[PDB]
Amino acid sequence: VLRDNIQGITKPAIRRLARRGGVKRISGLIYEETRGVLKVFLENVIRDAVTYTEHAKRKTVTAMDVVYALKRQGRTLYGFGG
Amino acid sequence: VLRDNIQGITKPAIRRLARRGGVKRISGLIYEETRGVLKVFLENVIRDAVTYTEHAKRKTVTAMDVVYALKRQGRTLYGFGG
Amino acid sequence: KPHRYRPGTVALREIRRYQKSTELLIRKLPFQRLVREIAQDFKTDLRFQSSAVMALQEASEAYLVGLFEDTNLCAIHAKRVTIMPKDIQLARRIRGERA
Amino acid sequence: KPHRYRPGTVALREIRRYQKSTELLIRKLPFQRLVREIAQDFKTDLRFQSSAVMALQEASEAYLVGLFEDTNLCAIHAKRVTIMPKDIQLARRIRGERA
Amino acid sequence: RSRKESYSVYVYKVLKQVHPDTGISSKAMGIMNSFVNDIFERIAGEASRLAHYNKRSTITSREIQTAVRLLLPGELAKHAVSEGTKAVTKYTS
Amino acid sequence: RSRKESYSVYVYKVLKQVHPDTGISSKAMGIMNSFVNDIFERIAGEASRLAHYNKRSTITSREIQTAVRLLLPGELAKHAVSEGTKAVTKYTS
Amino acid sequence: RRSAR
Amino acid sequence: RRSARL
Amino acid sequence: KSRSSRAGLQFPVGRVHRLLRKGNYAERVGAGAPVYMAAVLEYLTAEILELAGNAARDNKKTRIIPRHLQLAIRNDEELNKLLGKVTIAQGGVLPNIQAVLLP
Amino acid sequence: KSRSSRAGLQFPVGRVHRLLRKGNYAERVGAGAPVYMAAVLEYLTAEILELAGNAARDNKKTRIIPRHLQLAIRNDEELNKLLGKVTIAQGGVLPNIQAVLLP
DNA sequence: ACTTTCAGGGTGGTATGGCCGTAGGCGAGCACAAGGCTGACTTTTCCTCCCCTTGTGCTGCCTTCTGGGGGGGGCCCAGCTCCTCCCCATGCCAGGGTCTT
DNA sequence: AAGACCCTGGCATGGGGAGGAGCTGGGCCCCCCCCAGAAGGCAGCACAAGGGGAGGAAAAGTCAGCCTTGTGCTCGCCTACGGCCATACCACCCTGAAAGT
């Protein structure tokens, strides 16, 4: 069933994200923390993106719904339409 | 009102501000840092307030000019109109 | 010699006293002089409403109190009780005021 | 025995490699499954454009990279090089996300 | 000079509904007025964008309801929507 | 028959002005489109609020100029204001 | 008189 | 043919 | 009966409609839009006023002051999120000391 | 000639005028408002393109990719301040490492 | 490369905005005091910063199996477009109730 | 308490959006295969953390001084209001061309 896919954000993937941020040494408890942070961020944007989608009485979440949900969240994304 | 008016933010005044913030011990180099931080914040708000006033061809910086400048800064202030 | 409190108890008393109150903690005349000194660099011969200066003072004081709370968190992070300039700098950097 | 690099230089090698590149650092299919699973809790039988999931991934990865920069700053503040969950919590708290 | 109008009369009426024996000062009432103006501009501004996204020239209660959902967090949105939907139902009836 | 709105032609002309021998990718060009759409919405929104504050029903080059001053920081606003006034002077004359 | 949550 | 500030 | 009376509200349904039309948020404004917005604004105000009045009673006072409004907003996490970037003039701060600082 | 060419720009003065009128910003739009906005939009584009194009030349390339725009944007303090809360897709990050980092 | 939908021009009207004139009201400035707040000095004590030692937790290298990713194909549900027309929102005239001074 | 005026009512009207029909496009699902990478493990070592100690820099107390703040008055410059009138912008008719698929 579609459950526990947050483990698909593997330890090597988080290390790559941390390495791009300049981190050298990463504690073992970081990976559970980063997964909890990402889930909260995704839940926030997806909630607003779906709200835009049901407003237009649509069933497919467009790239522009995500851009609108991000922009209202505070973060503006360039390269997917305006 | 010509110069050296930043010193009017005296050391006891900054200590009272820190106590309201829950600070127990304050370093001796904090007061100079707090004065510079306050001055930068005031310059940003006043530049926006004066810009609003100059647009309306006025000479008196209204309380709404300050409220509008703060809202532009993302620092909405209640109690002075809106 | 008279009775002398150990350091820290008076600090806690001041913390409680100034967190229980809503007064402005900066003298009004020096702050008004500072505001007029800053604004004179943009437009000369300006005039200020009383409510304009009061709004500026309230905004500045709220901003400074919030920044000091963030600085206190940064100080506790480094295993300290004394707030240092580097704590303020880190709090401003994370907040975005210096990125 | 074969040569073994001293612990740490491989970290700078990876830092340079992953800061020079701009590719997405999370596998696309696991992230897509995660996005579809989160959105299932809001509305059932949803559909996603490919660019929708791409935008979500780009936003999430940029956000995580920025958060890790802030966490690294918090770690350096505490006289450390190993980032810990308390560093993430402090960076988020100063950023205003914890509220 | 012209007269100035705000929500002071209605805020007093709402306060009397919840707390019969509690008053409100002048400075507190000014904050309540600024709060109502702030939320009105937020909801209307979001509904303006929301209607423009769908190439709509009209702002309806659907636009307000979704703007409420976007802005109000958690259970604040849930209860506000029910109050807004209940009021509109009573209004049309 | 629905149109597609973009500044791709004009960004191409501007790019050929500053960099004669340099092209721009498809993804990079879509970034420039979002940037122009983003800044247009910022200045127009600021000019709209400036006209509303002074109870003005029109948006003039003075509203646009003040909006540029409020948004663009530092030497960006000084040069943007200078370029705008130079264009307007040429447009009328 | 008035209460919701 | 179009340069700007340094 | 006034429009607010029909909707059961104590807020200006008519004046909000004038505000919606005046603010050029759209070319046209629906009939039910002011009624929905006035109900939301009244519900939010009543929510704060009940919380602020409770704070005054806790502070054994019979009048609401800006400090009481600040206590209500910051204590409720739902209103705190809504008004996260909002400054209440003469509101003070929430009384809170970190445990590690205490003796 | 055309309105754009009369002002001496490359951006569409006519297209900007429609967007200002259609976007519900004010009941009327002046004659010089679209001309002023087009001049500013063209200037801001030329600044980024000149900086981004220089990035490709220094990175011994010939075509601008989203990475070059990010390098130009984040390196310029004025452009960085204007676009502080803006994410550039496929932009990566600026290569920067702390001083305490290096042994 | 073609076009057809948008760019550009001229004219009527009128609603918006500029210019003059005015009256008052608020903002800047000046005395005066008295005292509450500030600034400086001393003592000290307690926090900070440095050093050391170590044990644990992180890193680095290897091996192997798994699953992400790429190709190729098929469905069909959902999204976009055009006609119609019916119903809601707007504008104008008239009246009267309310909420601000 | 009075009344200025804005909200409600009634009616005529143009236009917007909602249903219906139709087409088609890509989102989803499946299958196969490969090899790049993740997961587990082991050896090593380096870093976080506790303990100890010196010193110096904040805190607390005391006291002398000063400059803030409350009260009162003057001047006069600015700002909101009102009226007159120019004029620039919107809508409509007409003609013509430009970049997007």
mmCIF file with all atom_site columns, C-alpha atoms in Angstrom, chain D:
data_model
loop_
_atom_site.group_PDB
_atom_site.id
_atom_site.type_symbol
_atom_site.label_atom_id
_atom_site.label_alt_id
_atom_site.label_comp_id
_atom_site.label_asym_id
_atom_site.label_entity_id
_atom_site.label_seq_id
_atom_site.pdbx_PDB_ins_code
_atom_site.Cartn_x
_atom_site.Cartn_y
_atom_site.Cartn_z
_atom_site.occupancy
_atom_site.B_iso_or_equiv
_atom_site.pdbx_formal_charge
_atom_site.auth_seq_id
_atom_site.auth_comp_id
_atom_site.auth_asym_id
_atom_site.auth_atom_id
_atom_site.pdbx_PDB_model_num
ATOM 1  C CA . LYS D 1 1  ? 46.450 -2.575 2.984   1.00 0.00 ? 1  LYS D CA 1
ATOM 2  C CA . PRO D 1 2  ? 45.089 -0.189 0.348   1.00 0.00 ? 2  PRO D CA 1
ATOM 3  C CA . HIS D 1 3  ? 45.243 3.555  0.831   1.00 0.00 ? 3  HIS D CA 1
ATOM 4  C CA . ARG D 1 4  ? 42.480 4.999  3.014   1.00 0.00 ? 4  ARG D CA 1
ATOM 5  C CA . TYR D 1 5  ? 41.750 8.722  2.912   1.00 0.00 ? 5  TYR D CA 1
ATOM 6  C CA . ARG D 1 6  ? 41.910 10.618 6.186   1.00 0.00 ? 6  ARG D CA 1
ATOM 7  C CA . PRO D 1 7  ? 38.395 11.223 7.584   1.00 0.00 ? 7  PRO D CA 1
ATOM 8  C CA . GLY D 1 8  ? 37.293 14.630 6.358   1.00 0.00 ? 8  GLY D CA 1
ATOM 9  C CA . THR D 1 9  ? 39.010 15.297 3.021   1.00 0.00 ? 9  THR D CA 1
ATOM 10 C CA . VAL D 1 10 ? 36.402 13.197 1.221   1.00 0.00 ? 10 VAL D CA 1
ATOM 11 C CA . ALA D 1 11 ? 33.871 15.540 2.821   1.00 0.00 ? 11 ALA D CA 1
ATOM 12 C CA . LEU D 1 12 ? 35.422 18.584 1.134   1.00 0.00 ? 12 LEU D CA 1
ATOM 13 C CA . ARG D 1 13 ? 35.619 16.607 -2.108  1.00 0.00 ? 13 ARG D CA 1
ATOM 14 C CA . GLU D 1 14 ? 31.892 15.835 -1.914  1.00 0.00 ? 14 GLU D CA 1
ATOM 15 C CA . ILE D 1 15 ? 31.106 19.419 -0.885  1.00 0.00 ? 15 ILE D CA 1
ATOM 16 C CA . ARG D 1 16 ? 32.846 20.791 -3.966  1.00 0.00 ? 16 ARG D CA 1
ATOM 17 C CA . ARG D 1 17 ? 31.303 18.140 -6.220  1.00 0.00 ? 17 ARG D CA 1
ATOM 18 C CA . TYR D 1 18 ? 27.739 18.767 -5.015  1.00 0.00 ? 18 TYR D CA 1
ATOM 19 C CA . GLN D 1 19 ? 28.052 22.556 -4.948  1.00 0.00 ? 19 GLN D CA 1
ATOM 20 C CA . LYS D 1 20 ? 29.457 22.676 -8.481  1.00 0.00 ? 20 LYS D CA 1
ATOM 21 C CA . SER D 1 21 ? 26.520 20.631 -9.803  1.00 0.00 ? 21 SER D CA 1
ATOM 22 C CA . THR D 1 22 ? 22.860 21.633 -10.074 1.00 0.00 ? 22 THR D CA 1
ATOM 23 C CA . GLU D 1 23 ? 21.204 18.225 -10.494 1.00 0.00 ? 23 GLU D CA 1
ATOM 24 C CA . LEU D 1 24 ? 18.421 17.122 -8.171  1.00 0.00 ? 24 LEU D CA 1
ATOM 25 C CA . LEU D 1 25 ? 19.905 15.199 -5.243  1.00 0.00 ? 25 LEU D CA 1
ATOM 26 C CA . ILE D 1 26 ? 16.826 13.072 -4.441  1.00 0.00 ? 26 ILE D CA 1
ATOM 27 C CA . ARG D 1 27 ? 15.740 10.118 -6.554  1.00 0.00 ? 27 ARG D CA 1
ATOM 28 C CA . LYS D 1 28 ? 12.699 11.126 -8.585  1.00 0.00 ? 28 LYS D CA 1
ATOM 29 C CA . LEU D 1 29 ? 10.512 8.050  -8.096  1.00 0.00 ? 29 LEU D CA 1
ATOM 30 C CA . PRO D 1 30 ? 10.701 7.907  -4.254  1.00 0.00 ? 30 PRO D CA 1
ATOM 31 C CA . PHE D 1 31 ? 9.926  11.620 -4.054  1.00 0.00 ? 31 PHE D CA 1
ATOM 32 C CA . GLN D 1 32 ? 7.029  11.232 -6.490  1.00 0.00 ? 32 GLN D CA 1
ATOM 33 C CA . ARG D 1 33 ? 5.615  8.397  -4.393  1.00 0.00 ? 33 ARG D CA 1
ATOM 34 C CA . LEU D 1 34 ? 5.997  10.521 -1.258  1.00 0.00 ? 34 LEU D CA 1
ATOM 35 C CA . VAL D 1 35 ? 4.224  13.488 -2.873  1.00 0.00 ? 35 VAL D CA 1
ATOM 36 C CA . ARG D 1 36 ? 1.357  11.289 -4.055  1.00 0.00 ? 36 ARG D CA 1
ATOM 37 C CA . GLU D 1 37 ? 1.054  9.756  -0.583  1.00 0.00 ? 37 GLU D CA 1
ATOM 38 C CA . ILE D 1 38 ? 0.952  13.113 1.227   1.00 0.00 ? 38 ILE D CA 1
ATOM 39 C CA . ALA D 1 39 ? -1.620 14.522 -1.201  1.00 0.00 ? 39 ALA D CA 1
ATOM 40 C CA . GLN D 1 40 ? -3.773 11.417 -0.750  1.00 0.00 ? 40 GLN D CA 1
ATOM 41 C CA . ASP D 1 41 ? -4.553 12.646 2.772   1.00 0.00 ? 41 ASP D CA 1
ATOM 42 C CA . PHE D 1 42 ? -6.139 15.833 1.366   1.00 0.00 ? 42 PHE D CA 1
ATOM 43 C CA . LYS D 1 43 ? -8.118 14.693 -1.690  1.00 0.00 ? 43 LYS D CA 1
ATOM 44 C CA . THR D 1 44 ? -8.433 11.188 -3.089  1.00 0.00 ? 44 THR D CA 1
ATOM 45 C CA . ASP D 1 45 ? -7.958 10.227 -6.746  1.00 0.00 ? 45 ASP D CA 1
ATOM 46 C CA . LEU D 1 46 ? -5.767 13.231 -7.492  1.00 0.00 ? 46 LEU D CA 1
ATOM 47 C CA . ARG D 1 47 ? -3.534 13.536 -10.539 1.00 0.00 ? 47 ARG D CA 1
ATOM 48 C CA . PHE D 1 48 ? -0.193 15.286 -10.885 1.00 0.00 ? 48 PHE D CA 1
ATOM 49 C CA . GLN D 1 49 ? 1.441  16.930 -13.857 1.00 0.00 ? 49 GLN D CA 1
ATOM 50 C CA . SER D 1 50 ? 5.070  15.970 -14.365 1.00 0.00 ? 50 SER D CA 1
ATOM 51 C CA . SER D 1 51 ? 6.029  19.630 -13.991 1.00 0.00 ? 51 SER D CA 1
ATOM 52 C CA . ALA D 1 52 ? 3.968  19.773 -10.786 1.00 0.00 ? 52 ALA D CA 1
ATOM 53 C CA . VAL D 1 53 ? 6.104  17.112 -9.114  1.00 0.00 ? 53 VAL D CA 1
ATOM 54 C CA . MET D 1 54 ? 9.218  18.668 -10.651 1.00 0.00 ? 54 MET D CA 1
ATOM 55 C CA . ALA D 1 55 ? 8.322  22.037 -9.105  1.00 0.00 ? 55 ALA D CA 1
ATOM 56 C CA . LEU D 1 56 ? 7.619  20.414 -5.744  1.00 0.00 ? 56 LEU D CA 1
ATOM 57 C CA . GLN D 1 57 ? 10.988 18.647 -5.866  1.00 0.00 ? 57 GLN D CA 1
ATOM 58 C CA . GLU D 1 58 ? 12.882 21.793 -6.860  1.00 0.00 ? 58 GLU D CA 1
ATOM 59 C CA . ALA D 1 59 ? 11.256 23.799 -4.072  1.00 0.00 ? 59 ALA D CA 1
ATOM 60 C CA . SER D 1 60 ? 11.840 21.072 -1.482  1.00 0.00 ? 60 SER D CA 1
ATOM 61 C CA . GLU D 1 61 ? 15.492 20.584 -2.390  1.00 0.00 ? 61 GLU D CA 1
ATOM 62 C CA . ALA D 1 62 ? 16.231 24.319 -2.406  1.00 0.00 ? 62 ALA D CA 1
ATOM 63 C CA . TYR D 1 63 ? 14.499 24.648 0.969   1.00 0.00 ? 63 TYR D CA 1
ATOM 64 C CA . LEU D 1 64 ? 16.469 21.743 2.437   1.00 0.00 ? 64 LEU D CA 1
ATOM 65 C CA . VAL D 1 65 ? 19.776 23.100 1.123   1.00 0.00 ? 65 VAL D CA 1
ATOM 66 C CA . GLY D 1 66 ? 19.053 26.485 2.691   1.00 0.00 ? 66 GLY D CA 1
ATOM 67 C CA . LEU D 1 67 ? 18.024 24.865 5.962   1.00 0.00 ? 67 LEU D CA 1
ATOM 68 C CA . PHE D 1 68 ? 21.260 22.873 5.993   1.00 0.00 ? 68 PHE D CA 1
ATOM 69 C CA . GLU D 1 69 ? 23.268 26.058 5.441   1.00 0.00 ? 69 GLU D CA 1
ATOM 70 C CA . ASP D 1 70 ? 21.535 27.613 8.452   1.00 0.00 ? 70 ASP D CA 1
ATOM 71 C CA . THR D 1 71 ? 22.069 24.435 10.488  1.00 0.00 ? 71 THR D CA 1
ATOM 72 C CA . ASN D 1 72 ? 25.766 24.480 9.611   1.00 0.00 ? 72 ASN D CA 1
ATOM 73 C CA . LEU D 1 73 ? 25.956 28.076 10.832  1.00 0.00 ? 73 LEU D CA 1
ATOM 74 C CA . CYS D 1 74 ? 24.282 27.056 14.101  1.00 0.00 ? 74 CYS D CA 1
ATOM 75 C CA . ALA D 1 75 ? 26.756 24.178 14.471  1.00 0.00 ? 75 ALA D CA 1
ATOM 76 C CA . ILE D 1 76 ? 29.762 26.432 13.862  1.00 0.00 ? 76 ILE D CA 1
ATOM 77 C CA . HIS D 1 77 ? 28.354 28.811 16.475  1.00 0.00 ? 77 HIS D CA 1
ATOM 78 C CA . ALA D 1 78 ? 28.432 26.056 19.120  1.00 0.00 ? 78 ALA D CA 1
ATOM 79 C CA . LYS D 1 79 ? 32.098 25.258 18.334  1.00 0.00 ? 79 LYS D CA 1
ATOM 80 C CA . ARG D 1 80 ? 31.327 22.076 16.414  1.00 0.00 ? 80 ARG D CA 1
ATOM 81 C CA . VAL D 1 81 ? 31.469 20.579 12.946  1.00 0.00 ? 81 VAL D CA 1
ATOM 82 C CA . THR D 1 82 ? 28.909 17.778 13.425  1.00 0.00 ? 82 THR D CA 1
ATOM 83 C CA . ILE D 1 83 ? 25.397 19.095 12.839  1.00 0.00 ? 83 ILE D CA 1
ATOM 84 C CA . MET D 1 84 ? 22.828 17.804 15.329  1.00 0.00 ? 84 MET D CA 1
ATOM 85 C CA . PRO D 1 85 ? 19.018 17.891 15.568  1.00 0.00 ? 85 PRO D CA 1
ATOM 86 C CA . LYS D 1 86 ? 19.243 20.755 18.070  1.00 0.00 ? 86 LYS D CA 1
ATOM 87 C CA . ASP D 1 87 ? 20.980 22.792 15.360  1.00 0.00 ? 87 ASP D CA 1
ATOM 88 C CA . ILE D 1 88 ? 18.087 22.152 12.971  1.00 0.00 ? 88 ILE D CA 1
ATOM 89 C CA . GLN D 1 89 ? 15.616 23.059 15.707  1.00 0.00 ? 89 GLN D CA 1
ATOM 90 C CA . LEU D 1 90 ? 17.405 26.323 16.504  1.00 0.00 ? 90 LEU D CA 1
ATOM 91 C CA . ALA D 1 91 ? 17.648 27.317 12.839  1.00 0.00 ? 91 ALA D CA 1
ATOM 92 C CA . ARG D 1 92 ? 13.952 26.597 12.337  1.00 0.00 ? 92 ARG D CA 1
ATOM 93 C CA . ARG D 1 93 ? 12.994 28.439 15.530  1.00 0.00 ? 93 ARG D CA 1
ATOM 94 C CA . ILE D 1 94 ? 14.898 31.577 14.548  1.00 0.00 ? 94 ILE D CA 1
ATOM 95 C CA . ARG D 1 95 ? 13.432 31.277 11.040  1.00 0.00 ? 95 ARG D CA 1
ATOM 96 C CA . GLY D 1 96 ? 9.973  31.370 12.638  1.00 0.00 ? 96 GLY D CA 1
ATOM 97 C CA . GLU D 1 97 ? 8.829  27.979 11.348  1.00 0.00 ? 97 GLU D CA 1
ATOM 98 C CA . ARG D 1 98 ? 8.193  26.425 14.770  1.00 0.00 ? 98 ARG D CA 1
ATOM 99 C CA . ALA D 1 99 ? 6.041  29.376 15.946  1.00 0.00 ? 99 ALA D CA 1
#
